Amino acid sequence: GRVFRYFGDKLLISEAKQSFTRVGENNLTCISCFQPRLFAYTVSKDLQLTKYDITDFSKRPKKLKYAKGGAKYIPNTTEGHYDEILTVAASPDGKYVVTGGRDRKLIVWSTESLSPVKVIPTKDRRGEVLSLAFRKNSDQLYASCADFKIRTYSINQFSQLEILYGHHDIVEDISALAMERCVTVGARDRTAMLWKIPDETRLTFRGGDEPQKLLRRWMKEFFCEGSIDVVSMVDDFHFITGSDNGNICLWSLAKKKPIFTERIAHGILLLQPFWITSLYAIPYSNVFISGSWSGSLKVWKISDNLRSFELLGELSGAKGVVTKIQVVESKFRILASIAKEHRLGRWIANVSGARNGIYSAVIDQ
Template identity: 40%
Template structure:
């Protein structure tokens, strides 16, 4: 939800003549802009803070009000704009919520606190407990492609990329209409969407033969490893093992520009929230910054150095900074682009040095790579490792706040005859069961929702604890392999003809993308998981019987109990963080 607290003044205010006076310090919330999700947001976000302490109005509003408000002071102008913003928020609270029997002032206060919290870059929404993963519906969709390596969403579309150099655009299904007319006083209800596959809109595949004949060929010549979609719905960006970074038109998937600045495979992409500033990660150990604001031909900005190994994943939010993980250098780095500095967070450890109860020493000792990263807010982020652990980090500490070991369980140990070529193998030399890697990690920005994936047949839902120092389990999307049914039968990965049978994510979950349904997530969460027979970066892990495609999970929200004019399920925003 955008507001005049969050839109940069440079986008709305008039150009001023250059001055020799020392400029005032920039307000921190100017970087924390929020994407415009609805048309009526523009009326609320019709002002921004100016250098003289007041607020600048939109250009069309300024022309009509210059003469009318010519004699007002800066304080009167701030008061007038704040009153206008408050009136618009009251209208949205009345439209977006069923306020029957609920104190409207409580909803209004909560909404204002949320706006300020996002401006400060803090976790302000605790919605993980309101989701019902056990009631989630699912739909598998796929084409005749190789393993799906990544997925990106920009509602109502999803974009998948594959190892056969293919980019596919899908249109996701819409939620069904309300059961009750809007004129009734009953609370409208939403039903789970039918199990209908998304519609395939466009598809584009790279061609090595054409690239060999034409040096100016605008397409991928190798496996596509990552994809990202801009929030304004204009651009889709892909990166691959051919070292190419390609910007596509989101409507037609037509290539607009090809960059070859990276010297090795492009492994990660992230848009700065609410802008068209792009960050890319590569196996050449660098992070590059790009600007897509001015349209083609776009612009390369700068390169960031620091990692000692391949940069395999990247994440970003509203501020002009990003977080990366460097695989075998076992570090996560927070890059402050404006300050041209970085913070280093080191994983791993030893049994002797670590004695905390919430950290498994064996889990730390086995941490040889950090493969996945996702940001919760501007101060907290999570990482996933090959030792199966999910770590919670704060930018104020060099070591993790909390480590959740073996989040997706263990692989069954090999049989002695499979692990050894000897006729009578030594059981002591057989490798024990190994933890499953964290192959996908995603968060809902500025909330307590965390999603992770591996190859255990499901996507797991976690939440950030109230004290923001631990990770707690919430539920499972799908059902893990080898889980006993009520009849005592152990189910394995296979085809399911009965809709009532437990359903599995058949393959390696290589990536996860999500967005909220309805007004501020009132209708639940849509989760899209990219699934493949093999790992996105190589063939060292393959799943027997796996599928190449993607899975859509529609997670509904639990029904709220409203009593005595208050909603007990909602919690106040934690402003202190």
């Protein structure tokens, strides 16, 4: 599968409708969206499962259902998370929504009733679940943890499909699409790998190549990377990545190098560049998006040659910690996840204009 979607010159851009909604709880972890009515799913570092509907583009999202935790599940499979669920996604049929977190237990939920449908213990001391990705149109399930392990589960069989090993560093981020394969990034490794699951094969990517290259390049006339933050897989054959040093790198299987690279995406503040907090694309399109506590949504376009990208524009509408980004259309309405504190706990300085909840954006054409 590849990109057949070129709207890149259509977008309502500047006039995009921007709004916010204040929420009850604090430190919002993640946001998912089910598209066949539209659905919205967020779990909280406050120990709650939270469900809304945006299905109108004329108005802000609207309450549906919630179920809140406590300490009351503390012991080893118990129905509920007494600790913080660090990621969430829902069954691509909309029949289910699943959660995992600091307590390294799998709690999957029947959405409609919104009560535990099932629970699978991960079985480790180290097994905290960092991220979740479904394959399209499937209850196949890819899951990543810091024990370097990758776990796969087909929902309706509620059974453990497969397991993988192999990043020298912890596994922050995985992306997945219709065909069977997925990608993981090893953070402080400065590497990223691809996974053909049945074939059980990984292919390898290395960034991080020093400064005193930039300098030496540009003296014919400013940052190392410490870690690979995140990855959004645009097609089968191309994808993008981002790093605390604010470098955005589109990588492609064609070469073992990055096929294009960018610096200081969200800017700086010797001195500190911004991390790239949330990197997300809409499938098989020419456009992706990033966000950071510098609070400017940066929407980038792929050029038809697909050999470079360009900025479409910025949406100031969000400020502070940006965990997740999701594009839902029927037009476009982007739902942003903003807490005042980053997902994994190494804190980000003096967030101001800070807030907690959903951010709304309405684009058309």
